[PDB]
Design an enzyme around this catalytic site. Structure first.
Site, PDB file in Angstrom:
ATOM      1  N   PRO A  50      50.966  -0.540  22.633  1.00  0.00           N
ATOM      2  CA  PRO A  50      50.543   0.648  21.852  1.00  0.00           C
ATOM      3  C   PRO A  50      48.891   0.456  21.563  1.00  0.00           C
ATOM      4  CG  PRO A  50      51.751  -1.144  20.296  1.00  0.00           C
ATOM      5  CD  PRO A  50      52.085  -1.305  21.861  1.00  0.00           C
TER       6      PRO A  50
ATOM      7  N   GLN B  39      55.510   3.382  19.571  1.00  0.00           N
ATOM      8  CA  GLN B  39      55.634   2.361  18.507  1.00  0.00           C
ATOM      9  C   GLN B  39      55.748   2.984  17.141  1.00  0.00           C
ATOM     10  OE1 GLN B  39      52.003   0.193  17.285  1.00  0.00           O
ATOM     11  NE2 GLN B  39      53.100  -1.632  17.367  1.00  0.00           N
TER      12      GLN B  39
ATOM     13  N   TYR C  32      50.338  -4.543   8.531  1.00  0.00           N
ATOM     14  CA  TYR C  32      50.855  -3.300   7.887  1.00  0.00           C
ATOM     15  C   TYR C  32      51.934  -3.548   7.065  1.00  0.00           C
ATOM     16  CZ  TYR C  32      47.309  -1.739  11.482  1.00  0.00           C
ATOM     17  OH  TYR C  32      46.045  -1.531  12.051  1.00  0.00           O
TER      18      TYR C  32
ATOM     19  N   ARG D 293      57.505  -5.577  16.975  1.00  0.00           N
ATOM     20  CA  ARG D 293      56.154  -6.260  17.208  1.00  0.00           C
ATOM     21  C   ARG D 293      56.135  -6.895  15.857  1.00  0.00           C
ATOM     22  NH1 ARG D 293      50.454  -4.931  19.921  1.00  0.00           N
ATOM     23  NH2 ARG D 293      50.247  -6.799  21.030  1.00  0.00           N
TER      24      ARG D 293
ATOM     25  N   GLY E 151      46.043  -4.441  27.248  1.00  0.00           N
ATOM     26  CA  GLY E 151      45.570  -3.468  26.427  1.00  0.00           C
ATOM     27  C   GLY E 151      44.012  -2.926  26.994  1.00  0.00           C
TER      28      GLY E 151
HETATM   29  C1  LIG Z   1      41.969   0.573  21.191  1.00  0.00           C
HETATM   30  C2  LIG Z   1      43.110  -0.277  20.682  1.00  0.00           C
HETATM   31  C3  LIG Z   1      44.311   0.150  20.011  1.00  0.00           C
HETATM   32  C4  LIG Z   1      45.087  -0.619  19.357  1.00  0.00           C
HETATM   33  C5  LIG Z   1      45.224  -1.747  19.643  1.00  0.00           C
HETATM   34  C6  LIG Z   1      44.300  -2.569  20.292  1.00  0.00           C
HETATM   35  C7  LIG Z   1      43.150  -1.721  20.860  1.00  0.00           C
HETATM   36  C8  LIG Z   1      42.144  -2.341  21.546  1.00  0.00           C
HETATM   37  N1  LIG Z   1      46.278  -2.614  19.451  1.00  0.00           N
HETATM   38  C9  LIG Z   1      46.405  -4.085  19.781  1.00  0.00           C
HETATM   39  C10 LIG Z   1      46.770  -3.939  21.209  1.00  0.00           C
HETATM   40  O1  LIG Z   1      48.188  -3.391  21.398  1.00  0.00           O
HETATM   41  C11 LIG Z   1      46.900  -5.326  21.981  1.00  0.00           C
HETATM   42  O2  LIG Z   1      47.597  -6.118  21.375  1.00  0.00           O
HETATM   43  C12 LIG Z   1      45.358  -5.801  22.233  1.00  0.00           C
HETATM   44  O3  LIG Z   1      44.434  -4.942  22.735  1.00  0.00           O
HETATM   45  C13 LIG Z   1      45.297  -7.350  22.787  1.00  0.00           C
HETATM   46  O4  LIG Z   1      45.600  -7.161  24.226  1.00  0.00           O
HETATM   47  P1  LIG Z   1      44.421  -7.118  25.252  1.00  0.00           P
HETATM   48  O5  LIG Z   1      43.806  -8.418  25.555  1.00  0.00           O
HETATM   49  O6  LIG Z   1      43.510  -6.024  25.057  1.00  0.00           O
HETATM   50  O7  LIG Z   1      45.108  -6.956  26.630  1.00  0.00           O
HETATM   51  C14 LIG Z   1      47.353  -2.103  18.697  1.00  0.00           C
HETATM   52  N2  LIG Z   1      48.569  -2.844  18.654  1.00  0.00           N
HETATM   53  C15 LIG Z   1      49.553  -2.335  17.991  1.00  0.00           C
HETATM   54  O8  LIG Z   1      50.559  -3.222  17.616  1.00  0.00           O
HETATM   55  N3  LIG Z   1      49.516  -0.972  17.693  1.00  0.00           N
HETATM   56  C16 LIG Z   1      48.496  -0.372  17.858  1.00  0.00           C
HETATM   57  O9  LIG Z   1      48.554   0.972  17.878  1.00  0.00           O
HETATM   58  C17 LIG Z   1      47.413  -0.861  18.376  1.00  0.00           C
HETATM   59  N4  LIG Z   1      46.040  -0.095  18.520  1.00  0.00           N
END
Ligand SMILES: Cc1cc2c(cc1C)N(C[C@H](O)[C@H](O)[C@H](O)COP(=O)(O)O)c1[nH]c(=O)[nH]c(=O)c1N2
Ligand SMILES: Cc1cc2c(cc1C)N(C[C@H](O)[C@H](O)[C@H](O)COP(=O)(O)O)c1[nH]c(=O)[nH]c(=O)c1N2
Lengths: 359, 359
Positions: free
Chosen positions: B22, B98, B182, B230, B324
């Site tokens: 997400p 999510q 959260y 998560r 992500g």
């Molecule tokens: C723009 C954006 C948006 C969000 C997030 C990230 C980013 C960059 N991430 C964290 C995301 O799910 C992921 O865990 C991280 O981006 C790390 O993984 P990557 O290294 O980017 O592949 C995040 N995780 C989550 O649990 N719920 C969410 O809504 C979000 N929102």
């Protein structure tokens, strides 16, 4: 970097020199586009390109290449583009469209469903029209019906009506499809145009269709919006210096007739050719057209890497670089290019919900 | 390659092991999603990933992180998801969502708009709630309101209704957001939970809100669709062995409570911490949770290169790899990874109108 300098032409300003050229998706039904095109095009516009040119869109049903081609031959068809054009502008890119008529290459299968002329017993097929009843050959063996003066008159009108609709749907850039062996290209070429009337024979005669279409469209397309065309300036058929000289003269005539830019391409009018594919292989041809016709130009067919795109612009072989397949592979190719060329804050080639995280 | 082996969980089969986690877009309006989200998510689904989890979607207005956060706290909000869920499935990806409540981290500015708590005088802001009246600190200094028992019952019901809605909109995969500081994470952590009723103090009491929410959601969520969460399993706050041990024991209880897969993450409960960011850095921790709690897992936060994602799978550190930011850079990252890992016919990671030209 040259690739990320804006470009103004008439009242239109593109935020960079990257253009996504028209690329058929073959996902339409009876000419109507759907959420395939919608997401595909809005996604490309968000990717950062300065200009997005919608795929060859048929001016009339028999002028589709395939049963999956888009069409704009009725107001219902044009209205369908309205949400997409708005989505493209909201992304900050300029919406364009290529209006087309596949001529003898029409009534064909989708490229992944045969790529060939539709079978005679297949119920999706239709009569094709062309300047003369002469088949392309190879995988496209259907002999087209020979157009009469009345057919030429009707098709010209469909182009005009298409341009009128494109205008009302909100496009800001139009491209006449006079390339790739479709109807317009086939009128220019001696391989395919054996007519003995005002439309075949001499240079003036073979140019006539194209010039009359340009002129009839130009009456309805706003003076302040770029009016462009794609045209195959050589074939790699053993007649390249003569064909190119004649194509560059037609380009001076398009300029005289208000054309604002020319998308330079290959004719693909006949199959017996020897095209020398390779990186930026079109660069020197486009540079020639540009310098001798004194008209801005774009081209494609090998510029899809950031360094090649940057070099073509720096050398003034092109005004905009068209990148096709790289955008299919990666809809955010503009951002990839910006990072490669060390643009400051390259990630803000994208919208904030992406750009913020990519810094 | 293991990255392109399908994955079956309950009744759902994923076409490969790439999951898009997400990622908040901050583009919704009063929780309602719109054409930003539709094109974003349909575009990603066409990209090739087997699983697409929609961003943290608030179960109630005050559990949004920001004024731009998606919501699913009414039927009108869920209706909005309907067409996009069908877009994701049409592309062959599995639609998940999510559902979330940002707890004391709510009523914040978009990340490119200050990323801090909304000033008192700014009317876009709202009172936050949490286990206890204690501020996160740093950029989020607002002291949240301590939740009453009625607040706890109501929020649990908001999660059930959000699940019910998500189910009825056609999502095939749900993720409860118990991570990242959260609400749910903040009930678990002794940093943020200072309560002295049944909902804080002991391990069983800190766990209660999360377990009871899982149980309540489990009642309305279908048995044949994956029910996941998560959870931040450590904080890098100097108390890691201790915290990880309790966290894995909680994962055992989730499992006992019908959890099908656990998305393993970092708690981000408090700002005073030392997270050792690096390529696949979560790999050994996810591996431990997976092994010790005997739950399939996914994780993120640095697996975004094709070799790293493949290595983590071969080592059985993960069942799915979440990628992500790479997908924000390139919505077709699955195709990029297939090419890099030498999948046969790698271009058919994409739909025909792309795959055909790219082989
Ligand atoms: C723009 C954006 C948006 C969000 C997030 C990230 C980013 C960059 N991430 C964290 C995301 O799910 C992921 O865990 C991280 O981006 C790390 O993984 P990557 O290294 O980017 O592949 C995040 N995780 C989550 O649990 N719920 C969410 O809504 C979000 N929102
Ligand atoms: C899938 C697809 C769709 C089509 C095309 C291409 C591809 C791959 N091309 C040609 C295209 O505009 C471009 O000139 C070529 O793709 C070569 O440029 P690249 O090397 O791919 O950057 C194309 N050109 C055109 O004039 N009208 C169009 O509708 C079509 N249809």
């Amino acid at each position: 970097s040259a690739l990320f300098e804006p470009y103004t032409l008439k009242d239109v300003t593109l935020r960079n020199r990257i253009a996504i050229p028209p690329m058929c998706q073959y996902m339409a039904e009876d000419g109507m586009i759907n959420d395939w095109h919608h997401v595909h095009l809005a996604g490309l516009a968000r990717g950062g390109a300065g200009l997005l040119v919608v795929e060859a869109t048929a001016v009339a049903p028999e002028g589709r290449i395939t049963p999956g081609c888009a069409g704009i031959w009725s107001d219902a068809h044009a209205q369908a583009f309205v949400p997409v054009v708005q989505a493209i502008k909201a992304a900050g890119s300029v919406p364009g469209i290529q209006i087309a008529h596949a001529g003898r290459k029409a009534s064909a299968n989708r490229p992944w469903e045969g790529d060939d002329h539709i079978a005679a017993d297949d119920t999706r097929g239709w009569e094709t029209i062309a300047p003369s009843a002469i088949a392309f050959g190879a995988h496209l063996p259907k002999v087209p019906r020979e157009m009469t003066l009345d057919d030429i008159a009707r098709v010209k009108q469909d182009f005009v009506d298409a341009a009128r609709r494109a205008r009302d749907a909100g496009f800001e850039w139009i491209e006449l499809h006079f390339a790739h062996g479709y109807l317009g290209q086939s009128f220019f070429s001696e391989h395919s145009n054996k007519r003995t009337d005002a439309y075949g024979g001499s240079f003036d005669n073979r140019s006539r269709f194209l010039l009359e279409t340009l002129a009839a469209v130009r009456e309805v397309w706003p003076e302040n919006l770029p009016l462009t065309a794609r045209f195959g300036v050589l074939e790699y058929d053993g007649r390249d210096e003569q064909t190119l000289e004649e194509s560059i003269e037609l380009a001076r005539r398009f300029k005289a007739g208000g054309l604002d830019l020319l998308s330079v391409s290959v004719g693909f009018t006949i199959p017996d050719t020897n095209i020398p594919w390779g990186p930026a292989f079109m660069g020197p041809i486009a540079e020639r057209v540009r310098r001798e016709a004194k008209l801005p130009v774009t081209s494609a067919w090998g510029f899809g890497t950031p360094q090649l795109a940057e070099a073509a612009l720096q050398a003034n072989q092109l005004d905009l670089v068209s990148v096709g397949r790289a955008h299919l592979a990666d809809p955010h190719w503009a951002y990839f290019a910006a990072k490669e060329l060390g643009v400051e804050k390259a990630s803000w080639t994208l919208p904030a919900p992406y750009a913020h995280w990519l810094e």
